[PDB]
RNA sequence: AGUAGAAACAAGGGCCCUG
C-alpha cells in the first residue's frame, strides 16, 4: 500500500488499474490520477453490461480504453458508416441502437456545475449522464435502465466509503476538469528567503537547481581533492605497544570524606523482640523508648569534634520529649530553624525596581560559582568493604517475597540456585543497609507526602530474624526490630520533580571518630551501654535528600538481579562447554581473584565473591553522580585495550593522552571514583607482568 | 431473534385478548426467562416454546383457558408446581429434552385433575427401572404417556 | 426513555451556544476524531515515581458518583475513609475515592448473574492456558544452542484477516444499528459474523474492550527473533521457556493447535491447480483465475474461498507466489530456484546471452547476469551467503548442519550463477529430447542442469568436481568442504568456506508488484524470474478432505449427482428478488404457483416414477402448512419442492423421498445428499458441494438483520419515499424504494431488488475487445 | 547550615489553599 496502484487495487480490478496507468504514462500526467481514471473506465464497462440489440448482436461499443490514435479512427468510422455528423471532441461510448454517442461524467460535489459545463461544451448533441458519488443523477435525455443505475450507484457508494476511510476523498485525487493543477502556493517571502539561503557560488535557486540536475561525476578531480586533504592533515596513528598508556594521575589534597546518609560500620543498634500488632514506625519507636535504655542518653556539652553542637543537643531533647507525648511533631524554634533552614531562602528582587544606587548599596555581581575542590584517595574505603563482606549475626535482613509452585525441572533448578544465593546474601552487613534504606526511606517518603510543613520525627530502623541453630535449644527462632538511630525531615514541600529537602540524622556508635573520615558528623559522647559496659558516641549529621534518591534507594533491591545474572552467566557458560550440570562444582571451586595481601594474589571461590559483586552494585546505587557516570563510561576503552593485549590483537589509537586527560578531569571528591581509579592502576601494573601496553 | 420482537411481530395489530394460538419457536429468551407475557392473554388455548435456551419457569403469568403446552429442547428442571395454580385446566403437557432427574419434581402434577396426557422422552428419569408404572400409580388421572397408554395403546392423531 | 429526553435537552443546550453550533454545523463528522485529541492532553515523565507518590494520598482514584450511591457504598465501612464529596477538576462528573473501595466492592458489592463471558472475550489467553496444560516437560540440558535470527509468528490464529476486514467484524458483531453499508467480506463470511454475534448479544459488557480483544484475536504477532528447532506458533509463544543460548528445556509440543496441516493443504491445492492449468498454452492464465475463483475449502467450521485465503497467507513458496500474482496480490521480495530459497542482499546486472553446445555442435542460448551480486540462500537445514560476479561464483560461506543438504545447496547455487565449464560445453549425457519442449515449451539450460543433478548423484559429484579442488592449507582445514561435505579434509573445493551457526536471515518490509507471462513466468518489473512452473514437484496423488472444486473439468462425480446438484442450484437461483419468485410467492401465500415453476418441471424426470405421486402428496402438504401459518424452514422447502410437479396419489409414506438413482432425502434430518446447519444457514451441501444461498429473505433460525442485506441495493435518490427502521426492512415490499440512515452521517436510498452482477467478467471481456 | 552541579533548591500562590 506504499504506492497508489495498491490503493486502487484494493477495490478496483487490476486490469482497469493497468489501463489507467498506461494512459497516464502516454499523456505524461501524474500517476495520482490512476484512481480517478480507473473508476471512469470501470463504470463504462459495467455500463455496457454485455447488453444486446434486436439483432442478437452487441449494443454498446466502448471507445475510452483505446489509445488516442485509434479513438478518432473508430469515431470517424462509426460517424461515417451510420451516416452521422462528426463531433469536434472525443466521447466514451457509442450506443449503436440509438446511433448516438454517450458521454459519462462523475462529480463529487452534489451540484450541477459539472453537468452544466459539459452540456454547454457539447450542447444537446448527444446523451450525457452525470453520476454522483452520493446518489445524484443529472442528464439531458431519458434515464438509463434501472439495473445500470443500481450497479453504478452501489459501486460508487463503496468507492466513496473506501476513499473517505483513507482521506483521499478530496479535490486532489478527484478533481474536476478545471482544478487539475495543484501546486504549492509559493509566497513572496518564502522565495525571497530561498534565494538568500543558496550556497556562495550560486545566487539564485534556479542556478543551483540547474547545476544539480545535470551534475556529472569527475573522479579525477574528486581524487585530487581527497589526496590534497589527506596530505594537509597527517592523522596520527599510535600502536599502543610502542606508545604505552601512562598511569592515571589522581588529584592531591585531603582524604575524601564519608557522604552516605546512614553509617554502616560504626553504627550501633538496639534490638527488641518483634510484636506483630505494633509494626508501625511510630509504634516501634515508642516501644523501644519505653524500656528505658534509650532514656539514659544524656550527651555532654562539649562534642569530640564538629560544629553547631547546642542545636543538635536541643533537638535530641525535643525528640525525646515528643515521643513521651506520643506526637512526633517538632515546634519551630531557633535550633530547628537554623538546622532546617526554614527562612534562609533568598527573596527575589524585581529588575524594574533596580537602579545604580541599589547596586552600589549592596554588592551585585554574577554568582561566582564555587566549583568542587579536589580530594585525594580515601584510605578507609577498603575497611568498609572488608567489614561489609562479613556476616551480621542475623539473617532475613531485606524483605523478599515467596517462592511460587513448580512444574518442570527448570523451575526447580532456578529455585534451588535462588535459594542458595539468597541464603548467602541475607547474612551480610551490606544487606542490613539494604533493609535500613528500604524501610527508612519508605517511612520518610510516606511522612513527607502526608505531613509537609511539620518537622516530623522518623526512626532509622530495620527488621530481621535471629539465625537458626540446631534443633537443640529454643526452636522456631523469633523476629527482631532493630533501631540504628533516628531521623527527622524538615519541610518537604516538593513542588517540583527533583526537589530538595534537608533532613537530619542521629545515630549511635561505640567507636572513636576519625577526623579525616567523619568530618561531616558532629559526635557527642552519650553515657554508657551494656552488651559489659562500653562508652557511647552520638553521630549527628544534617544531610539532604530528594524525590529521586528516595525512589531509587527504595529500589536498591535491584543489585540481586545483576549479581545473580553475572554468577549464572559464568556458571551456565562453564557448564555448557562440557554439556553437563556443572553449577555446584563451579560455585564451590572456581577461584576469583579478589585482592592482594603481602604482595601475593588472594583468591576465594565464587560463593564468597558474590558478596564483593553485591557491594559493588550497592555502592553504585549509593554514590551515583555525574562523575561516576562519566568515569565508568570512559574507562571501558582501557579494559578493551587490556583484552586486546591478552589476545595479541595489535590495538591502536589516535590520541590516548587526551583520553587520560578527560578521565582525570572527572575525578573529584567522590570516594568511589578515586578508589576505582587507584584499583585500575594497580590492575594495569599487575598485568604488565604478563602483558604489554602500559608504562610504569 | 427475541421473544419480544417475535411476539410483537406475530401480533399484527391484534389485541392480546382475542388470540387462540401462539408460537415462539427458534427464538431466545434472556436468562432463560420468559419476557413479555402477562394475564392479558385470556382466550389463549395453545402455546409452544421450543429451543429458546430456557431453564426455569418463574415469570409465567396466570392463564386459565390454556389447555396445551410444549417446552421441548430446553433445560427446565424443578419448577412444576406453578401449573396447579396458573393452568389448572391443563390437559396436555410435554417436556422431552429437558433436565429432569427424579420423581419428586413430578409429584406436584397430581393436583392437575384435568391432566390427560404427558410426554417424557430423552430425560434421565426414563433411564430407570419400572418407571412408567410408578408414574401411572402416582398420577392416576393420566391415561396417555409419551403418546402411548397403558398396554402400549397408540393414541390417535388429534 | 427519559434518558432520550435528557440527551435531546442536552443537544438543545449545546445548540443554544454559539461556538458549539459553529463547530457542529461546519464540515463532516470526521472532525470528531480531530476534536478527540485537542482534549485530555496530559502526560508524565516518570510514571513510576508519580504513581508511588500518589498512592500515599488518602484518595488516589477518581470514580463515578451515581453508581456508588446506587450500590449503597458508604463513605466509611468501619473507621476507614473511602471517598468524600468533591468534583475532579478535569472531568467535572467524578468524585475522589480510595483504592480500599475496590476491595469492599469486591467482597460485598453488586454481583452479576454470570461472568463466564470473559472466557469468550479473552479466548486467546484461555487458549494459551489450555495449550500449556498439555505440554509434557522432559528434561533440562545444557549446551551451546545454535540460534538463527528470523521473522516468525507468535500467535496461533484461525482465519487470519486484514485490518480492513476486521473493522467491519467489530461493527457487525456489536454495533449493528451503526453498521456501514454491507461489504463483500461480510456477505461472503456470514457464518463467522453470526457465531461472534450470538456470544456477545444481549449482554452487559464494555463493548470497546471486546472489540479491541477481537482485534488482538485476529492479529498474528509477527516478530524478528532468534530461533532454534522447528518453527510453529505453538512454540514461539513460550520459546522463552524452552531454551536459550546455553540451556534447553526439552518438551513435546507436536499435538497442540495444529496450524501447519492447513498451510500444507493450501499449498498442495495451489500446486494442483497450477499443474492443471498448464494444458492451455494460449489461455493458461485465464483458466488459472477461473479455476481459483470456483474453488473453496473448509477451515474449522466455516467454508472459505481459496482466493481470499491465498491473499491472507504469508507462505513465501513458488506455488503460492504465482497464484498471488494472477489475482494481483502484492508479495514479499523473495526469490526461488527449485526447492531452494534466495534473498538478494545487493548488486545489479543485465541479461547477456551465451551459447552452449549440447552434443558436438548444437548451439543453445542461455542468459547470464553481469554484475556482482550477494545472495542469502536456504535449503533444508542449511543456509548460505554466496556472491556472484560476471558469470562466476566469487565465494560462498555456508553455516549449515548437514553434509547432504550442504552439497545440494552448493550445487543449486553454482547452477544459479551459471558458473563452471559445463555451461560453456554441455555434458555429453544430456540430449535434445530433454533440453526443451517436454509439452511444447522450451526449458532454459539452467533448469536442464538442475534436472540433471536431481536425476543421479554421479552427475552431482561431477558438477562439484568441476569447481576446482585444491589442497587444504594449514589452519583453513576447519573452513573447508570436501566432496562428502566434510568439516575438514586434506583437499577441498576451491573457495568454499565452512562455518558453524546458521546465517542470520535478512529482513525487508517491502512489497513488489510482479506480473506473469503466458508460460507462467513471474516477472517483477525487471528481468528476474522470481518463480516458474518448472520448480514444483512433478506430480502426486492426494485425497483432499473438506474441499469444493465446483468446476466441470475438476470433477470426478458422474452425470447423476452433478445433474441433481445443478437442479438444486437452479432452484436456489429463483430465490432472488422480484415478482414470480419463491419469496414473493411465499409472501402472497401463493404456494400453488411453486408447483409449476420452470425448475421443478426440469427436475421432475429424476423423481422415482413408481411412487412419484405419494412423495408428491407429502411434500405438497408440508409446504402448505409451512406457507399458511407463516412458520417455515426455507431449506426444507427447497429440499422438497422438486417433488411437487406431479399429481397427488394414494399410498403409504415410509419416510424417505427417493430419486431415480437410489439416493433419497429424508424430510428433516441432514444427510449426505442434502445437508445444512443452523449455525451456517448460508450453505447447502449437496454431495459435498457447497451451494451458496442468496440472502434475500430470513428464516426462523437464520432470521436477523443480515439475512436480507443482499436483497437491497442503492438507487437514485428520491426524497418522497419514507424513512424506516432497520428492523422494518423485513416487511418492505419487493421493488419498493425506501430512504435509510447508513453508518454515520449518511442518508441513502435503497431499493429491494438484487442487482450485483459480476464485475470482473464484464471488465475482462471489454478489455479483451480493446486488443482486437 | 546543607545538597549537587558546571545551575538550581533551601515552598509557592492568593489571614486562607496546593504537590
Swiss-Prot record, chain A:
Q: How is it modified after translation?
A: Phosphorylated on serines and threonines by host kinases, including human casein kinase II.
The principal localisation class reads host cell
Q: How is the cofactor bound?
A: Binds 2 manganese ions per subunit.
Q: Which cofactor does it need?
A: Mn(2+)
Chain span(s) of sequence motif Nuclear localization signal 2 (NLS2):
165-227
| Chain positions of motif Nuclear localization signal 1 (NLS1) | 108-123
InterPro entries with a match to the protein in the record:
INFV_PA (IPR037534), PA/PA-X (IPR001009), PA/PA-X_sf (IPR038372)
| Alphabetized Gene3D superfamilies for the sequence | Influenza RNA-dependent RNA polymerase subunit PA, endonuclease domain (3.40.91.90)
User: What's in the GO CC field?
Assistant: host cell cytoplasm; host cell nucleus
Cystine bridges: which residues?
none
Positions annotated to bind Mn(2+) 1: 40, 92, 103-104
Keyword check for Nuclease: yes
Which Pfam families did the record assign?
A: Flu_PA
Q: What class of enzyme is it?
A: hydrolase
Gene Ontology molecular-function annotations: endonuclease activity; metal ion binding; RNA binding
Location(s), subcellular: Host cytoplasm; Host nucleus
Listed A to Z, the keywords are: Cap snatching, Endonuclease, Eukaryotic host gene expression shutoff by virus, Eukaryotic host transcription shutoff by virus, Host cytoplasm, Host gene expression shutoff by virus, Host nucleus, Host-virus interaction, Hydrolase, Inhibition of host RNA polymerase II by virus, Manganese, Metal-binding, Nuclease, Phosphoprotein
Family affiliation: Belongs to the influenza viruses PA family.
Protein purpose: Plays an essential role in viral RNA transcription and replication by forming the heterotrimeric polymerase complex together with PB1 and PB2 subunits. The complex transcribes viral mRNAs by using a unique mechanism called cap-snatching. It consists in the hijacking and cleavage of host capped pre-mRNAs. These short capped RNAs are then used as primers for viral mRNAs. The PB2 subunit is responsible for the binding of the 5' cap of cellular pre-mRNAs which are subsequently cleaved after 10-13 nucleotides by the PA subunit that carries the endonuclease activity.
Subunit: Influenza RNA polymerase is composed of three subunits: PB1, PB2 and PA. Interacts (via C-terminus) with PB1 (via N-terminus).
- Name of the protein this chain belongs to: Polymerase acidic protein
Organism encoding this protein: Influenza C virus (strain C/Johannesburg/1/1966)
Curated annotation (Swiss-Prot), chain B:
Compartment(s) of residence: Nucleus; Cytoplasm; Endoplasmic reticulum
Question: What happens to this protein after translation, modification-wise?
Answer: Phosphorylated on serine residues, at least in part by casein kinase 2/CK2.
Kindly state which keywords UniProt assigns to this record, in alphabetical order. Cytoplasm, Endoplasmic reticulum, Host-virus interaction, Leucine-rich repeat, Nucleus, Phosphoprotein, Repeat, Repressor, Transcription, Transcription regulation
Annotated Gene Ontology cellular component terms: cytoplasm; endoplasmic reticulum; nucleoplasm; nucleus; perinuclear region of cytoplasm
Query: Which superkingdom is the protein from?
Result: Eukaryota
- Residue positions, PTM Phosphothreonine: 15
Q: Where is the LRRCT domain?
A: 123-158
For bias kind Basic and acidic residues, which ranges apply?
147-156
One GO biological process from the UniProt record? Answer: intracellular signal transduction
Query: Keyword Protease, does the record have it?
Result: no
Q: Could you say what the effect of mutating residue 158 to A is?
A: Complete loss of phosphorylation
* Any one GO MF annotation of this record: histone binding
Tissue-specificity statement = Expressed in all tissues tested. Highly expressed in kidney and skeletal muscle, moderate levels of expression in brain, placenta and pancreas, and weakly expressed in lung. Found in all regions of the brain examined (amygdala, caudate nucleus, corpus callosum, hippocampus and thalamus), with highest levels in amygdala.
Residues recorded as bearing Phosphoserine in the entry: 17, 158
Q: What is its main location?
A: nucleus
- Which residues form the LRR repeats? 18-38, 43-64, 65-87, 89-110
The annotated subunit structure for this chain is: Component of the SET complex, composed of at least ANP32A, APEX1, HMGB2, NME1, SET and TREX1. Directly interacts with SET. Interacts with ATXN1/SCA1. Interacts with MAP1B. Interacts with ELAVL1. Part of the INHAT (inhibitor of histone acetyltransferases) complex. Interacts with E4F1. (Microbial infection) Interacts (via C-terminus) with influenza virus A protein PB2; this interaction promotes viral replication.
Q: Which family does this protein fall into?
A: Belongs to the ANP32 family.
Name listed for the protein in its UniProt record: Acidic leucine-rich nuclear phosphoprotein 32 family member A
Q: Which residues of the full protein are shown?
A: 1 to 158 of 249
Curated annotation (Swiss-Prot), chain C:
List keywords of the entry alphabetically: Cap snatching, Eukaryotic host gene expression shutoff by virus, Eukaryotic host transcription shutoff by virus, Host gene expression shutoff by virus, Host nucleus, Host-virus interaction, Inhibition of host RNA polymerase II by virus, mRNA capping, mRNA processing, Viral transcription, Virion
Compartment annotation: Virion; Host nucleus
**Mind listing the GO biological process terms from this record?**
7-methylguanosine mRNA capping; cap snatching; DNA-templated transcription; symbiont-mediated suppression of host gene expression; symbiont-mediated suppression of host mRNA transcription via inhibition of RNA polymerase II activity; viral RNA genome replication
> Would you say which domain of life the source belongs to?
Viruses
* Cellular component GO terms held in the UniProt record: host cell nucleus; virion component
Single GO MF descriptor: RNA binding
Grouped into one coarse class, the protein's main location is: virion
Q: How does it assemble?
A: Influenza RNA polymerase is composed of three subunits: PB1, PB2 and PA. Interacts (via N-terminus) with PB1 (via C-terminus). Interacts with nucleoprotein NP (via N-terminus). Interacts with host ANP32A (via C-terminus); this interaction promotes viral RNA synthesis.
**Family in the record:** Belongs to the influenza viruses PB2 family.
Q: What does this protein do?
A: Plays an essential role in transcription initiation and cap-stealing mechanism, in which cellular capped pre-mRNAs are used to generate primers for viral transcription. Recognizes and binds a wide range of cap structures of target pre-RNAs which are subsequently cleaved after 10-13 nucleotides by the viral protein PA. Plays a role in the initiation of the viral genome replication and modulates the activity of the ribonucleoprotein (RNP) complex.
Protein name per UniProt: Polymerase basic protein 2
Species annotation: Influenza C virus (strain C/Johannesburg/1/1966)
Lineage summary: Viruses, Riboviria, Orthornavirae, Negarnaviricota, Polyploviricotina
What is the name of the gene encoding this protein?
A: PB2
